[PDB]
RNA sequence: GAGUCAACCCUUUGCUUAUCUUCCCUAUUUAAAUCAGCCGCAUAGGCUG
């Protein structure tokens, strides 16, 4: 809450929009966490919230069909066959401006964090994206909630979401109320005994497969308190919010 | 024993960014514009081969079209590549194999490989069917706050050249382990008054249109895959067969259909098994077997 | 009155349309291609020639 | 020309091989004359006076 | 990890006959817009091609 730094217009290219069999467009908060926790792993700062916007999102392609990529050959099984129509494996892709805003505590100094995060973006992916260009991250100070939308006032416009809760099951309830799904996390279901092929033989090896959880993209204005917008682990792998149930 | 591993990665080191498209003036270079897409119809017959019965019927189609506004005549092609180390670092698979390799490999020139894709950069091979018909064809490149004006051309007869080995030098010194560089290549192109662009397609289920255009925010784009193949041209390292064709394992272009490096003892995995079971093999294949593990991707099976 | 290219778009409110670059009537790259190459005088009749395509 | 851009080792050159044995001016000829006789501007010139072409 | 080449959309057309829009109204208060020029890190006569 002391310090936060923010990146605005952040270029990202080719970004992977198959994020599951039937998920496609938005990549998932997941990600978001995997990039947090390599963040925290490798600068050394224990990180508790997370915080994401969209400017802008085009898909490759158009209603339907959107996009598909040309594999070629690049398994040792080849040498008659390999010479005309490789397998198609379709794929769409996806480009992308965003923006981020992190939280960081440190007291040694006030800038060289900014250059190894800077060092670091500079030098990662986003779900299979690129990083093109991006503005110089810019920090922010807070001290307690009340003064926090300040905060608000500071980075506009963008767009936010927010949790809305589910009623029984989504299977129908997606269609009537007309939102957007997202993967909240992942449940495991069994372990995997082989450890073989795996990059690590220590690392437990489960089994998960993904949870849907109701998102919705609104004003930032409309929203009358932030801890809605605020993301924290919870237990049996979940993401929970800090406000709870949305209310008027 | 050494059994070859059916899982291992490496991470794309030259990574190539959305090539974005313009129009401006020869002398006016201050003032740019972005170039449209738009759509129009054509009305043309059939030719097929051996149908002679359906010559006397019509056909209606309707596709994309990209050209330069009514008064302009230089073409803008700016975008931006980045070249990364960590090269014989394993991103997924591998933590005992790779050194393996790397006790035989370090014995290549890397500055060859540098000197080829800058090469290839400046010359222009990233512009696949914009440079028929363009008298003057220049880039300027500005890396690391200094820029270089290059007027390079004949991409055949290749000849050694001083006045673009710092950059090679600087690069491949990059790429034995260092960290990041970026370049913005900004060629400009004089092709014509009005004349027909050609930015990259993409393939659809069949639609209302036939041939669409890749577009960003109403402008036409290049794909990165096309820019990348671009780059990764340099594969000069066979007896016969000129004007060299992109590195691949297995080596051969579907789109002319043709198939090179097939399996007669001219492969990637063919090569190190027997290097380290006998003697060793020529400087020749150390370059081309390290040319393809620069670029990225999952090998195995 | 002018005579510019034509287009043939699906069901909507006109009835016959025209070719325009930002409002400017005009005629595709091709109708002027197919006059260019008509100088098919090679076969055996027919003067006045036609263009050159197979068939 | 006689360079096929998809394609062809063999059979184009050996196609290319067998021609340029005949007479590129008559095609350039008829091809200019095309294009000045306005016979490229289509029926707009019914009704016409007089016509003038610059290149 | 490359969607790649080629193309004539053409001919013809009567939109026209009539029409009441109408009553009522407090924009209030405060205001400051101020010739780079030689030796000088100086708002003391100025001898300057």
Not at chain 1, 53 to 61: L, M, Q
Not at chain 2, 85 to 110: I, M
Not at chain 2, 204 to 230: C, P, R, T, W, Y
Request: proline share 3%; aromatic share 10%.
């Amino acid at each position: 809450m002391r310090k936060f730094i923010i990146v605005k217009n952040v270029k990202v290219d080719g970004i992977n929009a198959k994020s599951s069999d039937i998920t496609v467009g938005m990549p998932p908060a997941t990600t978001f966490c995997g990039l947090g926790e390599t963040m925290s792993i490798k600068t050394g700062i224990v990180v508790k919230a997370v915080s994401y916007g969209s400017v802008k999102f085009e898909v490759r392609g158009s209603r339907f069909n959107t996009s598909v990529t040309k594999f070629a050959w690049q398994d040792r099984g080849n040498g008659g066959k390999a010479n005309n129509n490789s397998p198609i494996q379709p794929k769409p892709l996806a480009d992308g401006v965003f923006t981020l805003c992190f939280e960081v505590e440190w007291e040694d100094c006030a800038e060289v964090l900014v250059d190894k995060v800077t060092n670091f973006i500079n030098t990662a992916r986003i779900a299979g994206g690129t990083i093109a260009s991006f503005n110089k991250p810019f920090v922010k100070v807070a001290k307690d909630a009340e003064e926090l939308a300040s905060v608000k006032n500071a980075m506009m416009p963008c767009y936010v979401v927010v949790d809305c809760g589910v009623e029984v099951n989504i299977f129908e309830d997606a269609v009537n109320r007309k939102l957007q799904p997202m993967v909240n996390g992942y449940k495991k279901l069994e372990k995997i005994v082989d450890n073989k092929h795996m990059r690590d033989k220590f690392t437990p090896a489960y089994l998960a497969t993904p949870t849907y959880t109701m998102i919705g993209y609104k004003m930032v204005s409309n929203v009358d308190n932030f801890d809605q917008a605020l993301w924290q682990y919870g237990e049996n792998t979940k993401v929970k919010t800090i406000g709870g149930i949305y209310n008027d | 024993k050494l059994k070859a591993p059916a899982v291992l990665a490496y991470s794309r080191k030259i990574n190539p960014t959305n090539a974005l498209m313009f129009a401006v003036n020869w002398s006016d270079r201050d003032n740019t514009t972005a170039v449209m897409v738009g759509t129009k119809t054509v009305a043309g017959t059939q030719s097929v081969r051996g149908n002679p019965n359906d010559a006397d019927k019509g056909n209606i189609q309707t596709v994309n079209f990209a050209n330069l506004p009514h008064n302009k005549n230089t073409l803008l092609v700016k975008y931006n590549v980045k070249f990364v180390g960590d090269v014989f670092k394993a991103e997924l698979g591998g933590g005992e194999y790779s050194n393996t390799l790397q006790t035989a490999l370090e014995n290549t020139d890397f500055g060859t490989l540098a000197y080829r894709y800058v090469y290839n950069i400046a010359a222009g091979r990233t512009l696949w069917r914009n440079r028929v018909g363009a008298e003057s064809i220049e880039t300027v490149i500005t890396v690391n706050d200094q820029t270089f004006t290059f007027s390079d051309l004949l991409v055949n007869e290749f000849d050694e050249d001083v006045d673009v080995a710092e950059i090679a030098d600087m690069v491949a010194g990059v790429l034995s382990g260092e960290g990041f560089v970026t370049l913005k290549v900004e060629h400009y192109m004089l092709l014509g008054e009005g004349s027909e662009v050609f930015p990259s397609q993409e393939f659809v289920e069949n639609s209302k249109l036939s041939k669409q255009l890749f577009d960003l925010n109403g402008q036409a784009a290049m794909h990165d895959q096309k820019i990348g193949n671009a780059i990764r041209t340099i594969d000069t390292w066979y007896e016969d067969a000129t004007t060299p064709i992109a590195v691949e394992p297995y080596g051969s272009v579907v789109r002319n259909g043709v198939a090179y490096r097939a399996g007669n003892k001219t492969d990637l995995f063919t090569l190190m098994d027997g290097a380290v079971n006998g003697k060793s093999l020529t400087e020749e294949d150390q370059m081309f077997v390290t040319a393809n593990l620069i670029r990225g991707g999952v090998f195995g099976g």
